[PDB]
């Protein structure tokens, strides 16, 4: 019934035990008790109290050790007290000796009586053990005796009677063993107990096929037939979670990048579901993950180019400025790459690249700031720059379809100021504005910026209204508030100057009666 492997048993034996007894008549009797469906239970009996100098031997059959170390012998017997019935002074006994002999030969006819070695004298105990074979309760005292270490192939066990009323009910022969158990996600095989009580057995078992050894696993198989302290845990491999037995793989829609104790996590947002036992959730079409970026982070989109581009020119240098991108994609690392083209010079589309050493003081390629300044550019020659937005993923991702660019001139000056501005309509809610283009353009006019600032009060933040058309209307203004309007012409070639300061007071509904 126990985890310990048995060698010899009274019930488990095939038919007869095959035990050699000396003498045959008047010695050990085959008094067996039958209490099973057509199957008997073997028991040896001897009771020669009246006869003097009684000596009865009972040797067991050949026992195959099968790689044993320490053998435990459990004997269940009935011992009749010498007080129960009157007898002869110093004749009756209440003890029986236990003998053992090691041999190599399998089948033997006779074993030498004097050659046997005694283990210990077995006697009765006060506490009776309750163990029954049939329906009625039987109270027989049990005794356990250990012997070891054994070097030979097998051994023989002998029972000696010195004139006592005894019956050997159950004879169990078994060795203690450490069972096959899986602890700390590592397999441990069946190991036999040590030869000494003060000696421990070092057991090192191999880990699961779908798991990697992080720490060396070891267990100590004690003399009792069980492990003591577990040292070293085997962590589950990437794409496999913790389970009762072996490391179970991650289900459809789960991933595990590194060997961690935590279970399989669900796919991050905007990521395609992979098959059972995946390392990392792959990104679907339109989304791509960076090499330097962690597996825990979700899939990101490619960046967008900044729509607005402001350019100011000097005699030999050019200054560029742009706003933040529209679609970020989902990454904090946004850089800008400036590309020289020299396509501005000449009417045809095809041109030669900037082979010469163009110097730009802030950064060469991949600037984090939204402002850049290009120097040492040749005068009288037309140029064009392509400010291409670069993300952390954009390298792995395909080259972005479009990049916002602006064509500029070197030697040509900045635009002049507007000669005069005029108000067309004057009402309590809106004031219309009209203006002409400046006297000297010095380039193609692209935008007109208008500034508004309140008078008689503290300086409020300037109102910005961008209109390419030569006419604009003000909106949402309080009555009786005088306002100064300033227009500024803006080109790709440069920055314009402030216009005529027009002081117009907001119209009011009449109140004076004549």
User: Residue 366 region, left (φ>0) first, then alpha (ψ -120 to 50), else beta?
Assistant: left
Taking a C-beta distance cutoff of 8 angstroms, is the pair 146, 194 a contact? Answer: no
Residue 59's φ and ψ, nearest 5 degrees, are: -95, 140
Give the residue from 435, 459, 429 showing the smallest Cα distance to 447: 435
Could you tell me the end-to-end alpha-carbon distance of the chain, in angstroms, rounded to an integer? 124
Taking a C-beta distance cutoff of 8 angstroms, is the pair 143, 122 a contact? Answer: yes
Which segments within 38-123 are labelled E, that is strand? Answer: 44-46, 56-59, 63-64, 71-79, 95-103, 117-123
Torsion angle (degrees, nearest 10) of CA 345, 348, 351, 354: 20
Rounded Cα distance between 102 and 150, Å, is 8
Does residue 400 sit in the same domain as residue 336?
Answer: yes
CB neighbour burial string for 454-469, b if at least 16 within 10 angstroms, e if fewer? eeeeeeeeeeeeeeee
**Whole-number Cα distances in Å, 71 to 9, 13, 119, 193, 226:** 14, 19, 12, 10, 16
Q: In sequence order, what are the residues at sequence separation of 6 or more whose Cβ sits closer than 8 angstroms to the Cβ of residue 186? A: 205, 206, 207, 208, 211, 217, 232, 233, 234
Give the residue from 384, 214, 390, 242 showing the smallest Cα distance to 302: 390
Q: In sequence order, what are the residues at sequence separation of 6 or more whose Cβ sits closer than 8 angstroms to the Cβ of residue 512? A: none
Residue 224's φ and ψ, nearest 5 degrees, are: -75, -15
Q: In sequence order, what are the residues at sequence separation of 6 or more whose Cβ sits closer than 8 angstroms to the Cβ of residue 384? A: 341, 342, 343, 344, 405, 406, 407, 408
The secondary structure element, H or E, covering residue 338 is: strand 334-340
Does residue 52 sit in the same domain as residue 123?
Answer: yes
Does residue 339 sit in the same domain as residue 379?
Answer: yes
Does residue 134 sit in the same domain as residue 123?
Answer: yes
Rounded Cα distance between 121 and 145, Å, is 10
Taking a C-beta distance cutoff of 8 angstroms, is the pair 433, 424 a contact? Answer: yes
Radius of gyration for the alpha carbons in the chain, expressed in angstroms and rounded: 52
Rounded Cα distance between 159 and 224, Å, is 26
User: Angle at the Cα of 438 (from 435 to 444), degrees rounded to 5?
Assistant: 110
Give the residue from 181, 57, 71 showing the smallest Cα distance to 115: 57
**The token pair that represents 505 in the structure block:** 């007071």
Does residue 51 sit in the same domain as residue 143?
Answer: yes
Does residue 183 sit in the same domain as residue 162?
Answer: no
Torsion angle (degrees, nearest 10) of CA 266, 267, 270, 273: -120
Q: Where among 185, 210, 233 does a domain terminate?
A: 233
Q: In sequence order, what are the residues at sequence separation of 6 or more whose Cβ sits closer than 8 angstroms to the Cβ of residue 462? A: 451, 452, 453
**The token pair that represents 389 in the structure block:** 């937005």
DSSP 8-class letter at 364: S
Q: Residue 445's domain is classified under what CATH number?
A: 2.60.40.10
**Whole-number Cα distances in Å, 109 to 19, 20, 112, 128:** 11, 9, 10, 38
The runs of H, that is alpha helices, within 69-174 are: none
Is residue 347 reached through a cis peptide bond, with omega within 30 degrees of 0 on the bond before it?
no
Which segments within 42-88 are labelled E, that is strand? Answer: 44-46, 56-59, 63-64, 71-79
Q: Where among 129, 158, 176 does a domain terminate?
A: 176
Taking a C-beta distance cutoff of 8 angstroms, is the pair 403, 389 a contact? Answer: yes
Does residue 372 sit in the same domain as residue 422?
Answer: no
The experimental technique behind this entry is X-ray
Rounded Cα distance between 98 and 81, Å, is 19
Q: Residue 270's domain is classified under what CATH number?
A: 2.10.50.10
Domain that holds residue 482: 414-514
- Using CB atoms within 10 Å of the CB of residue 432, give its burial: 0 to 12 exposed, 13 to 18 middle, 19+ buried: middle
Q: Is 447 helix (H, G, I), strand (E, B) or coil?
A: strand
Q: Where among 413, 431, 450 does a domain terminate?
A: 413
Which segments within 410-509 are labelled E, that is strand? Answer: 421-426, 431-435, 445-454, 463-467, 471-473, 483-491, 502-504
Rounded Cα distance between 239 and 211, Å, is 10
Does residue 183 sit in the same domain as residue 159?
Answer: no
Rounded Cα distance between 336 and 370, Å, is 8
DSSP 8-class letter at 147: E
Give the residue from 111, 113, 91, 112 showing the smallest Cα distance to 162: 91
**Whole-number Cα distances in Å, 460 to 302, 312, 409, 501, 505:** 40, 27, 36, 17, 17
Question: How many domains in the chain?
Answer: 5
**The token pair that represents 511 in the structure block:** 């109140």
Rounded Cα distance between 118 and 158, Å, is 9
């Amino acid at each position: 019934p126990a985890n310990e492997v048995t060698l010899l048993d009274s019930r488990s034996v095939q038919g007869e035990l095959g035990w050699i007894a000396s003498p045959l008549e008047g010695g050990w009797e085959e008094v067996s008790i039958m209490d099973e469906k057509n199957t008997p239970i073997r028991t040896y009996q001897v009771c020669n109290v009246m006869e003097p100098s009684q000596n009865n031997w009972l040797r067991t059959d050949w026992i195959t050790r099968e790689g044993a170390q320490r053998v435990y012998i459990e004997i269940k017997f009935t011992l009749r007290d010498c007080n129960s019935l009157p007898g002869v002074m110093g004749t009756c006994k209440e003890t029986f000796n236990l003998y053992y002999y090691e041999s190599d030969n399998d089948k033997e006819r006779f074993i030498r009586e004097n050659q046997f070695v005694k283990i210990d004298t077995i006697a009765a105990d006060e506490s009776f053990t309750q163990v029954d074979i049939g329906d009625r309760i039987m109270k027989l005292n049990t005794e356990i005796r250990d012997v070891g270490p054994l070097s030979k192939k097998g051994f023989y066990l002998a029972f000696q009677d010195v004139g006592a009323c005894i019956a050997l009910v159950s004879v169990r022969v078994f060795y203690k063993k450490c069972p096959l158990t899986v602890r700390n996600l590592a397999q441990f095989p069946d190991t036999i107990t040590g030869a000494d009580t003060s000696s421990l057995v070092e057991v090192r078992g191999s880990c699961v096929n779908n798991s990697e050894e992080k720490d060396v696993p070891k267990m100590y198989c004690g003399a009792d037939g069980e492990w003591l302290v577990p040292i070293g845990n085997c962590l589950c491999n990437a794409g496999h979670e913790e389970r009762s037995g072996e490391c179970q793989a991650c289900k459809i829609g789960y991933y595990k990048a590194l060997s961690t104790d935590a279970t399989c996590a669900k796919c991050p947002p905007h990521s395609y579901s992979v098959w059972e036992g995946a390392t990392s959730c792959t990104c679907d079409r339109g989304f791509f993950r960076a090499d330097n970026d962690a597996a825990s982070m979700p899939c990101t989109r490619p960046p967008s180019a900044p729509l607005n581009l402001i350019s100011n020119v000097n005699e030999t240098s050019v200054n560029l400025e742009w706003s933040s991108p529209q679609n970020t994609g989902g990454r904090q690392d946004i850089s800008y790459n400036v590309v020289c083209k020299k396509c501005g010079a000449g009417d045809p589309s095809k041109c030669r690249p900037c082979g010469s050493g163009v110097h730009y003081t802030p950064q060469q390629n991949g600037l984090k700031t939204t402002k850049v300044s290009i120097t040492d550019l040749l005068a009288h020659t037309n140029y064009t720059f392509e400010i291409w937005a670069v993300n952390g993923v954009s390298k792995y991702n395909p080259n972005p379809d479009q990049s916002v660019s602006v064509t500029v001139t070197t030697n040509q000056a900045a635009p002049s100021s507007i000669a005069l501005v005029q108000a067309k309509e004057v009402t309590r809610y809106s004031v219309a504005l009209a203006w002409l283009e400046p006297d000297r353009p010095n380039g193609v006019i692209l935008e007109y910026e208008v500034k508004y600032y309140e008078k008689d009060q503290n300086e409020r933040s300037y109102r910005i209204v961008r209109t390419a058309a030569r006419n604009t209307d003000i909106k949402g203004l309080n009555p009786l508030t005088s306002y100064v309007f300033h227009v500024r012409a803006r080109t790709a070639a440069g920055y314009g100057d402030f216009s005529e300061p027009l002081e117009v007071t907001t119209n009011t509904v009449p109140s004076r009666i004549i």
